[PDB]
């Protein structure tokens, strides 16, 4: 089994809208996404999620809610991406464009799935229903899923 590297993903989800960012470069460029990145040495996963939210969007939050975990495998890449997914409904400040991301709010009847990673179609609806989930997706490149598993869980 491949080694895995820790990543975070943070969704600011309010009652009628969600904050996404347009990835300007790097992994997932050109796709809307939550904010996040590699967990660093010495921080908890939740603290790494808070840090990435602040670095990529300018927003601070004191606390996050863990809602899911998704493991990504890419054909031809040796490491799995172990993505820990967090939400919050309570933000301090305004989103700001970073080098990584251009922020944009979307209404919850206008989730831009066509410009999001294909796997988000499966797990994002669970997040919106306040369910907790574990997922795994194997990709060939950026567009093709070869295998996946998704389960609703009571405890992440
Ligand atoms: N919604 C969604 N998010 C994903 C998928 N795959 C995936 O890695 N992510 C998230 C996890 C991270 O938030 C982000 C990947 O991390 P990143 O490459 O931006 O990490 P980073 O900010 O440390 O990278 P960098 O500045 O060094 O380039 O994308 C996916 O299929 N769907
Ligand atoms: Na980052
Ligand atoms: Na990032
Ligand atoms: Na899509």
Swiss-Prot record:
UniProt family annotation: Belongs to the Nudix hydrolase family.
One annotated GO biological process: response to oxidative stress
Activity modulation notes: Inhibited by 2-oxo-dADP and 8-oxo-dGDP.
Binding site for N(6)-methyl-AMP: 8, 23, 117-120
Keywords: Cytoplasm, Hydrolase, Magnesium, Metal-binding, Mitochondrion, Nucleus, RNA-binding, Transit peptide
Gene3D superfamilies in alphabetical order: Nucleoside Triphosphate Pyrophosphohydrolase (3.90.79.10)
Stated consequence of mutating residue 56 to A: Loss of ability to prevent DNA damage. Expected to cause loss of enzyme activity
Stated pH dependence: Optimum pH is 7.8-8.2 with 8-oxo-dGTP as substrate, and 8.0-8.5 with 2-oxo-dATP as substrate.
Outcome after substituting residue 27 to A: Reduces 2-oxo-dATPase and 8-oxo-dGTPase activities
Domain of life: Eukaryota
Protein name in the entry: Oxidized purine nucleoside triphosphate hydrolase
Binding site for 8-oxo-dGTP: 8, 23, 33, 35-38, 117-120
InterPro entries membership: 8ODP, Nudix_hydrolase, NUDIX_hydrolase-like_dom_sf, NUDIX_hydrolase_CS, NUDIX_hydrolase_dom
PROSITE patterns recorded: NUDIX (PS51462), NUDIX_BOX (PS00893)
Residues at which Mg(2+) 2 binds: 52, 55
Name of the gene encoding the protein in the UniProt record: NUDT1
Motif placement: Nudix box: 37-58
Subunit description: Monomer.
Binding-site residues, 8-oxo-ATP: 27, 35-38, 52, 56, 117-120
A matching Pfam family: NUDIX
Outcome of mutating residue 53 to P: Loss of activity
Cofactor annotation remark: Binds 2 Mg(2+) ion per subunit.
Cellular compartments per GO CC: cytoplasm; cytosol; mitochondrial matrix; mitochondrion; nucleus
Processing and modification events after translation: The N-terminus is blocked.
Result after altering residue 36 to R: Reduces activity by 97%
Source organism: Homo sapiens (Human)
SUPFAM superfamilies assigned: Nudix (SSF55811)
């Amino acid at each position: 089994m491949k080694a895995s590297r820790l990543y975070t993903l943070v969704l600011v989800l309010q009652p009628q809208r969600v904050l996404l960012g347009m990835k300007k470069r790097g992994f997932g460029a050109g796709r809307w996404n939550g904010f996040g990145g590699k967990v660093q040495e010495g921080e908890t996963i939740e603290d790494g999620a808070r840090r990435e939210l602040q670095e990529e969007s300018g927003l601070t939050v004191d606390a996050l809610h863990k809602v899911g975990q998704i493991v990504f495998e890419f054909v031809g890449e040796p490491e799995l991406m172990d993505v820990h997914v967090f939400c919050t409904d309570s933000i301090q400040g305004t989103p700001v464009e970073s080098d990584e991301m251009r922020p944009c709010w979307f209404q919850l009847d206008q989730i831009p799935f066509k410009d999001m990673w294909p796997d988000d179609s499966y797990w994002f609806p669970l997040l919106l229903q306040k369910k907790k989930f574990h997922g795994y997706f194997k990709f060939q490149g950026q567009d093709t899923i070869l295998d996946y598993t998704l389960r609703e869980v009571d405890t992440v």
